[PDB]
Amino acid sequence: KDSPIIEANGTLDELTSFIGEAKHYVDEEMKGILEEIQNDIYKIMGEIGSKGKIEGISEERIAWLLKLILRYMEMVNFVLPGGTLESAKLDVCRTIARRALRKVLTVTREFGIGAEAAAYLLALSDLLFLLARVIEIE
Amino acid sequence: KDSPIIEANGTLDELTSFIGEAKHYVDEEMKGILEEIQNDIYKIMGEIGSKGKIEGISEERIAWLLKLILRYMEMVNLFVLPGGTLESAKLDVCRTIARRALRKVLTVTREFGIGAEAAAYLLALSDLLFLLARVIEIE
Amino acid sequence: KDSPIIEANGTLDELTSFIGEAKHYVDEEMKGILEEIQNDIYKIMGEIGSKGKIEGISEERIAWLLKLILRYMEMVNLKSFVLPGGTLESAKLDVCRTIARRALRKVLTVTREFGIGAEAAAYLLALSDLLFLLARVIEIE
Amino acid sequence: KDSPIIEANGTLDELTSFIGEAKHYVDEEMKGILEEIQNDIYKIMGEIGSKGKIEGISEERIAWLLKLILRYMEMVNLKSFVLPGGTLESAKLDVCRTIARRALRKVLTVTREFGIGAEAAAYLLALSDLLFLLARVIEIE
Amino acid sequence: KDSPIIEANGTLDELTSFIGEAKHYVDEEMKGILEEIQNDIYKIMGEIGSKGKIEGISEERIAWLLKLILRYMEMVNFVLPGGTLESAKLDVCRTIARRALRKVLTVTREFGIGAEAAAYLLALSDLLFLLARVIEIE
Amino acid sequence: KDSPIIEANGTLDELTSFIGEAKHYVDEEMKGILEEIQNDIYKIMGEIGSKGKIEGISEERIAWLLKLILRYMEMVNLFVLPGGTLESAKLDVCRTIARRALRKVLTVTREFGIGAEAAAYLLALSDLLFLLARVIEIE
Amino acid sequence: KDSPIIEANGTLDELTSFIGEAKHYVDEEMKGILEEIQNDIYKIMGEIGSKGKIEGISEERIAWLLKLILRYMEMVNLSFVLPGGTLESAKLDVCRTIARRALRKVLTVTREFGIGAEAAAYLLALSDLLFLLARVIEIE
Amino acid sequence: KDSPIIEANGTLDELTSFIGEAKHYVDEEMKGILEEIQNDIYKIMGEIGSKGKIEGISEERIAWLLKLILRYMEMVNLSFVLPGGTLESAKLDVCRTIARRALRKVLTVTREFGIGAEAAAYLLALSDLLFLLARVIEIE
Amino acid sequence: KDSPIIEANGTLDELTSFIGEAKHYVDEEMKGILEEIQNDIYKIMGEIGSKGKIEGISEERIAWLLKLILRYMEMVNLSFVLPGGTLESAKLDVCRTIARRALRKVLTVTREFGIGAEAAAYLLALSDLLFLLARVIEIE
Amino acid sequence: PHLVIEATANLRLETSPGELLEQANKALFASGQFGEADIKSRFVTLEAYRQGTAAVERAYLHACLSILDGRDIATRTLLGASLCAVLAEAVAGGGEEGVQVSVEVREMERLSYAKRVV
Amino acid sequence: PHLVIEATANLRLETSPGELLEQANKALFASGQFGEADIKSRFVTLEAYRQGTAAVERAYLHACLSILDGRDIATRTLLGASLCAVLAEAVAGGGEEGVQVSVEVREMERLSYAKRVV
Amino acid sequence: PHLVIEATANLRLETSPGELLEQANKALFASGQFGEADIKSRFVTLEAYRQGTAAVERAYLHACLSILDGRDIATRTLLGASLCAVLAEAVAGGGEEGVQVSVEVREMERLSYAKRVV
Amino acid sequence: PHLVIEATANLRLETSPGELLEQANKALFASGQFGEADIKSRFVTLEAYRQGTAAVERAYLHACLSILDGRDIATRTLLGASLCAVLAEAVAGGGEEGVQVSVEVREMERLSYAKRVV
Amino acid sequence: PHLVIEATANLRLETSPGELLEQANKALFASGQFGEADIKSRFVTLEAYRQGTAAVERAYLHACLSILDGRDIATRTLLGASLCAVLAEAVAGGGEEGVQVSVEVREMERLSYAKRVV
Amino acid sequence: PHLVIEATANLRLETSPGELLEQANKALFASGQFGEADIKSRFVTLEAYRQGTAVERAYLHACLSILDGRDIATRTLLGASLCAVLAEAVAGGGEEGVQVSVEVREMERLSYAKRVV
């Protein structure tokens, strides 16, 4: 396939692997949230690898992300990354999500596809930041 | 001292460091396998950094990887999310970084005509890491 | 707004996150060293993101890194190349070292295209050397 | 949205229109053959305009064209090059054949740039051969 | 003159010649409409060849085309081109109008002139389609 | 097998086919003239397709075209809309396609340095086709 | 009148002139072989200058070169030697190097125009034969 | 110090060296002619190396070459012949081919810098004269 | 298998062949010098053809060339002369020009691949020594 | 597509704004570029307005058509011309001189455009 | 940024336009791309409106978000999606069928943008 | 060109909207970029509006100038600055703090722009 | 051109390999891309053959057409389709399931190709 | 994919040719690049064969794997290495020296490739 | 390199297939491009064959497979050598002349696997 497509799929796969690694340090609610995020990232990878031939995520996934972002923003009032080990894992996941966002943005500029995927990745990075801060507070 | 050479060597160093991190969560057999893999990756790093002047891995390393792949495929029922357990999650991360190193070495091969055996080794290593993660999940 | 700037900032964020993850496996002195390193990396990211409009790290930070490097070379005696990760704590620092090398490459691209961040690149190189030394020190201990 | 795609679809529409114009000068068998050809060309236009996301013609269409080509080659015996348009009906088919060659060139450009339409180009080549044979058959009859 | 200008003028000449050929198979009102269209094309040809120095068609020509289009859509409710020979002639004219539209669009992109000419050619292709369908229905 | 060569040959084939289609609406003299024109286009197509290796038309063909052109200007009062009659409309279509073929042959001449006489023949042919259409309209 | 065509023709003319110079130091059979080679090079020159319009050498010329090469390999047994053991073999060594230069020029022409593959094969076989002839002269 | 300038000067030096080698196989008149040719080539080399700053050859040198060419054409009647009918004529054939190579280099210099048209004309006339001299030696 | 590498090796082979041709006109001392030069050129050819994988000449070869250059400069007193005062010196003049051509090719290789600086220095010193040897033969 | 029609309070129309919007929607749908239910038109009356600097009573009618990107300048120009013809035909008069009628066709970014059906 | 929300007169909202604008402003501020006081939102009710050509009662809700240029398509798409989700949540119903909700994100030229505080 | 001035209901102006539009039109004509009768200005009052998320009463004044393409960034910036100066001088007060006044100069596509005089 | 047809031993053909090669040669000559005597075809039966890893008995028919370079993808695809149709129409059966028929069209380098008649 | 294995008549194999083909098919399927039923393998014994010019009788084993294009050099090299390892493991001996085992991986053009199932 | 010689059953050769393979291997080794033991040649007789659509014919075809990295001059010379060697070995066959052809194709060097047991 195309070099940007392969790079974006590889980076999204790496993000999924890191999220799967980090989901073993959180509680049940956050573990379920991270598993749903992993399923969404698989859907995004499918639609990116198919070059848009296969439909990707729907808008209600981004709506769900934004609802979680608001719910965790009302619980969060400058710190170094990794106040605890669990929050450090999510900080690493957030940085890798931003890297995947950069790759998907390159794909979007090249081929005109994946704008919703890029929006999902941006909201996911915001949610990961919020979750790390929530664990630090708790 | 070319940019693709530096990038590929750095990514292979990343892969070696991540494999060294992950080898502390596996049993003795897998730990020995991962140490052998680390030695092979160092050999690949040397031959890439020397721009092909230093000989790299031999074909019996790829044969050893393929034998391990067949052995572990004999016991793997081959869709799950990555990281069913933490130990398999570490190997999934190593697998994705192996794919990244494979991409970098493929760029080096396309531009300089060297490292086809290294790229084949990295592909087989990614397959083996996937199989090992699934084996740990099953066990 | 430039792609090299975004890549360098993202990779430096990755380095900071990995250092923050690894600082929970070391003792108090090394943890303080790593927190100071994280603060320096934040200062470097401010520099890079401003594209030179905001001042970055000072030379006494690189001097501090060099002092640590010599102090730990006084304790490290290696006879041959060793596989990374003889212990889990040293493996974490080896991962941090490799990501520091990646961030150094990104900052070198930024410097080569914009003429800024030479001191940041020197800091990243010294940080890679210090991370290698710290991993070997943990392995020895 | 691409210039070669628009050009190829326009030329295929032109070929379909010319075939529809020429089908009013032939007998019932040839008129049915030309209507089937028009349907196949519309299927090709859909495939090209979708840029491969919509399936196009099947292999049995090309097989049908080849069978017709063999059947009409069994009835055509030429000894030298002849002027196009010995009769008005054969002149229509000669014009259709030349426009089929133009559409083949456009589809070949599309195939070279996007990797799609090899079967469409094969169909257009076989269609050019069949149109030549049909014109010669009309001249003979 | 430049090569895109020469190509656009040649294709417009082809369209005019084909319309003149097809106007001998239609009735009196459509023949008069096609003669008016031929005069409009000649104004378009002049303004294209002059590279914008000579004024072209006015907006009331496009208004007249749109009035005809609405009138004939009032009479038209997938078919292969050329249900009859008369409609096949107009289908050929429509395809050549599409080709002329492509050439004029290239001219407009490269030199900033001929937007009204391109709009006229688009409306002309629509009207030719409608006229072919009307002839088929009648 | 170059793109401009293939395109020019295709357009010349189109012109020949349209001339052969239009020759069935004219009288005997014009039909014979159009047949000789088709033969000249065959020679032009061979010359262009062979990259100039095969000899094309001679200068007496262009002289014959010019003699016809003057003969028909002697009886033409020389703007009007194309297609005053169906027969003249056919020749107007042939004239426009001859101009298109002239453009393609001019391109071929610009890259390859061949076909100047063919381009001159096509220009004279377009002038003659215009004159013949006007003659049909007058008659 | 392309630059690579002119360069290849000039280098082939150089090779012909050097072969004509060197043919005055060899015996009768080698002199006749060299005159035949000069005629073949002239045919190659015509073919290249015409850009393929005029036919060049035939395959039986390359077959003749290969037969000579086999015949002289039957008489040559080498280890490494320096060029020019004698003056006569030095002339043929110079001819061999200029044949390699002409081969490079004809290869450029072939890569840019699709013509002269058989001419390049002839030049390669000619360089091999010149090497063999120089070694034969040294041995004798 | 441009690459085409250095190439042209090197090729002209090579031509001078080959002419100096070949002048030891001809008689006194041709030897004097070749020495004058060498001096003219040195003037051309100075002019090209200075990149037009130093004046080169005059038009009376080309006139002298043309007079020699006419004189020797009065004595030459040819059909096609292979280069090097005699060793002395083969030397001049080699000189002629190297003169044409130098002409190509000087033509490249002229196309890229606008200098050396008279030098290129001199080299063309020199190649014609060398051909004529080789044929004259062959006839004699 | 790069174009500049092939061109440089071909030109070095040309230089070796011409040196081997010219070594049959000099005395025993110069003949031994030229044979050593040919061996050094073969080492240079191996180094260039390997693209630096195989080591080439050492610095003591260039030192030996410079010592010879100084020795022969102690015996040479020049004004301007034309190449080829004698046939023996004309051979060395041709060798010097071909050495400069090989130097140009090796310089192109060095600019494009970063290898062969010592080879280029050796070729420059070799051209100087060939000039000196030609003048020495003319004086003697 | 979105169509906003701006009219001054002193402008007199042959038909009411409802019929004007019906005519505009029919003209837009006749182009074939839009779905029937996707054409959303709206009419706005301007109560505070001045045209130019002279002390002359004037009326003007402006419409902005917003469409998604990806259409050619020929299509955009034809849409503008059709809308302008409909609007000019709908104008009865207003002010002390002629009424200026203008139509804008502007493209919305299709990539960031959000759409839901409730 | 500037937010303009357009609703037909027959559209029924779960909350009044004030609460709708509060929710929209909170959603915009949650993105982190804007200052708190720079978010300016406004609600407009349309009295003369037509959707499509069919004789079916219809309602629609359209919002246009104007932001200064320099933000990526990911940010623009996320802003549009957030606004569309808020608006769809705010819609109670209207017309005889489903209500179409659409959001435009358009970029204003930052270089020529004038801003002053009195 | 087209100028739309949007003001919140709580905003107090030194002069009435008519004089505000007169001053804006004079400022636009003073640039020399437009014909006198081509300058069409309109004033809109907003009744449903929110600024930010804080519970503080605010007022804002926004204007959008739409011009055809082909003018440089210097001309666009000067037009925006002139409009912003006029609007700021026109503001008397409103809300509990300072009034934010902003002007956007957006650029119309001239090639597809339709214009007619009835 | 060179045509090699490879068939497994368990494959049953409607006609013998001689008539199969006659049909293939006629199909190749019907394209007009080759001289009559230049078409060289050959049929090979495979005695040792595996298809896949399952235990089900299978048969397959493969052909490789080798032509000189310089022909377009349209010609190559048409030749492949002609050969595939001719081969599929000649298969009576074989194995316990359907027979897979495949045709490759590969280009031979024209410059290095040597040919002569003895 | 198509696999052709060529062995000299004097070559001795540890297992039967059918077992070798089954092992090769398993090795190819283990790569994951091919469907199970699409892997077609065949074994050919050579009766007339020469290796080199020396008067020493030898043995060799060559395999050619033909796959459709679109796969990277890493995949091609891994497939070749897998096949070579399997073949070398299958070799028992032959001749008076070592047996040379070689594997080619060549690409078939996908656009002109024809495939039917009967 | 790999050399496959395909001959029809009705073709008559001056020498045996083994001697033809010997001559072909000698011709290939004389080029200096290959190692001695790397030249592997094989002769195949065709029992089911057709040439053209008309007459008994015989043809002799050879395919030389070499690793990539050699120039068109070397490839053409190898093809010409093989064609000459094959032509000298043809005695006759059929009722017309025997067409002898040699095709030289390049194998990809990077993906080529080679082992010695």
Numbering used by the authors:
A (entry chain C), E (entry chain S): 23 to 99, 103 to 163
B (entry chain B), F (entry chain R): 23 to 100, 103 to 163
C (entry chain D), D (entry chain T): 23 to 163
G (entry chain Q), H (entry chain I), I (entry chain A): 23 to 100, 102 to 163
J (entry chain U), K (entry chain E), L (entry chain M), M (entry chain W), N (entry chain V): 2 to 119
O (entry chain H): 2 to 55, 57 to 119
Excerpt from the paper describing this PDB structure:
Here, we describe and detail the use of sub-particle CryoEM averaging and present updated reconstructions of DARP14, a multi-subunit tetrahedrally symmetric protein complex. Originally described by Liu and Gonen et al. (2018), DARP14 was computationally designed as a scaffold capable of displaying small proteins for CryoEM. DARPins are small, ~17 kDa helical repeat proteins that feature variable residue loops capable of selective non-covalent binding to other proteins, akin to antibodies. Variants of DARP14 and similar scaffolds have since been generated and used to bind and image small proteins, such as GFP and KRAS.
In addition to focusing on the DARPin components, we also set out to extract as much high-resolution information as possible from the stable core cage component, this time by masking out the dynamic parts of the complex. To push for the highest resolution possible given the dataset, we created a mask that excluded the flexible DARPin components while keeping the core cage of DARP14 intact. Multiple rounds of 3D classifications and refinements using tetrahedral symmetry were made until no improvements to the map were observed. A final set of 277,091 particles were postprocessed using multiple rounds of Bayesian polishing and CTF refinement to obtain a final map of the core cage at 2.7 Å. At this resolution, we could model nearly every side chain of the complex. The map also shows possible sites of ions (mainly in the 3-fold trimeric interfaces) and water molecules (not modeled). At this point the resolution of the core cage is likely reaching the limits inherent to the sample and data collection parameters.
